[PDB]
Design a binder for this molecule. Structure first.
Ligand SMILES: c1coc(-c2ccnc3[nH]nc(C4CC4)c23)c1
Ligand SMILES: c1coc(-c2ccnc3[nH]nc(C4CC4)c23)c1
Lengths: 282, 282
């Protein structure tokens, strides 16, 4: 059974995925309750602190026999369900979703958060409409950013191991892992197929990724612009240092689209209509 | 002033280094009280759990306006004070101390603890005698060992960044950093001078270490055995994977010394004379 405290504020209903739809008793509004059976402390700590239109918001949390997390309900489900079994997303719909994913990831990075597990199944669509707001979820694997390397470097390396000194060159580029993921997500949305797979290949999945040699099927990509493909090429770079950042991506020719930037602002203000407190008129 | 609680159990006395000698009121025995002015939680968590004759033992802790740590008093001070200003340690005294440092570090590693800051100033001598017990201190920088890489690897790397997959090869060799430090400590004890320095050199300290090209002065090392030098060569290896472990070191020809292993056991049982509860005689 569900705990008394949760039962006191919410009316539990039909399952969504475990994730279940519930009704907030006070408001009669629908909510989503993610049950994480017995690190969730860190996920809430992050989510309570985080505030962006493209990042999921915690409404409430319950620490009982299991962990119960109350989130805003996403009527469109996962982005994964839109790309399954070679279901190709329309280029405009890709731009709109990607743009949001970039803003969302940029924000995380700004605030020292590395998602670490970005995938179509962690992106949620707000409505059943293709022109809708997306939201990033699953901060389970996320990391926070002062390095113990920095504390070490203040001292004289008389006793410091070489590898620690070598690690200095690479250091501070952990966030690049999220840009790789976005690159993989963008490839999936645009083509309908993944860039790295064990399907009809001899080469190991590890090897395709390490080499950065993605599976390019021309007939598929003929339907996709050079601008879109260029951006994928720029994010799917083996060297994290050379690999494009969210800021670099957001500045890319593909995203310099005034209609998409307009549609998102229009979707944004439409969501914010109910929340709007009267304005201080000059 | 010192807190009431600490004042209640201990009589504070003359400074040792901040570290001050105190007297346990119950026992009238001398103790050392390390004052760490306002991560100490982790250092105590480790030290309370740790139990070895060559690792410092916590007796008590006080969390007031500052952090007060009660430790067993080491009458011989730091190992650093024995090697300052080209003071060369006798080879036997090196073997004896090194052997203990190896046992101590091996134990840490066994229990998943990486010291991270091993240096002559973190090694304490029990008595003013050169044949004495040593103890490892300063667990401030120490790390504990399940990897978030291991949690990642359970999944399909479809979205995994290449660098994460590359990090797999190197992974699980963080403890090698302590073997480097022991190698640097052993060089210092044996020669009287450090292997890597900015004194009478053009080459950067980073560069000497990364290259692993230690400053070898033959006239100095003529007084030192080939067995001792070989061990230093084996620990001062740039590749952590190739670099000797504490077990490899403890198996080395230099440490297969029955008199040293005997002297340490004799020093050990002499310390344990006061603690000895009667034995269950068969
Ligand atoms: C897991 C983590 O977050 C969710 C989730 C959060 C907020 N609204 C939602 N609508 N549908 C889902 C799940 C069924 C896709 C969710 C599930
Ligand atoms: C700092 C960290 O530990 C100590 C310390 C711990 C136990 N006994 C000791 N005797 N002398 C010292 C200091 C003066 C060298 C210490 C100091």
């Amino acid at each position: 059974v569900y705990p008394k405290a949760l039962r006191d504020e919410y009316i539990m209903s039909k399952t969504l995925g475990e994730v279940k739809l519930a009704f907030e008793r006070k408001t009669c509004k629908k909510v989503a309750i993610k049950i994480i059976s017995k690190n969730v402390e860190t996920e809430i700590e992050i989510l309570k602190k985080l505030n962006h239109p493209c990042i999921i918001k915690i409404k409430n949390f319950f620490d009982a026999e299991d962990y119960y997390i109350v989130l805003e309900l996403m009527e469109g489900g996962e982005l994964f369900d839109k790309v399954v079994g070679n279901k190709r997303l329309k280029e405009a719909t890709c731009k709109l979703y990607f743009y949001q994913m970039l803003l969302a990831v940029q924000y995380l990075h700004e605030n020292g958060i590395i998602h670490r597990d970005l995938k179509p199944e962690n992106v949620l669509l707000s409505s059943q409409e293709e022109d809708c707001l997306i939201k990033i979820t699953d901060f389970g694997h996320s990391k926070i950013l002062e390095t113990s390397l920095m504390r070490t470097l203040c001292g004289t390396p008389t006793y410091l191991a070489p590898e620690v000194l070598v690690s200095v060159g690479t250091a501070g580029y952990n966030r690049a892992v999220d840009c790789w993921s976005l690159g993989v997500i963008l490839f999936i949305c645009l083509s309908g197929y993944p860039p790295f797979s064990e399907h009809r290949t001899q080469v190991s999945l590890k090897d395709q990724i390490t080499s950065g040699k993605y599976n390019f099927i021309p007939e598929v990509w003929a339907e996709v612009s050079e601008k879109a493909l260029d951006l994928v090429k720029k994010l799917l770079v083996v060297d994290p240092k050379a690999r494009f950042t969210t800021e670099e991506a957001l500045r890319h020719p593909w995203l310099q689209d005034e209609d998409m930037k307009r549609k998102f602002q229009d979707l944004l203000s439409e969501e914010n209509e109910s929340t709007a407190l009267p304005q201080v008129l000059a």
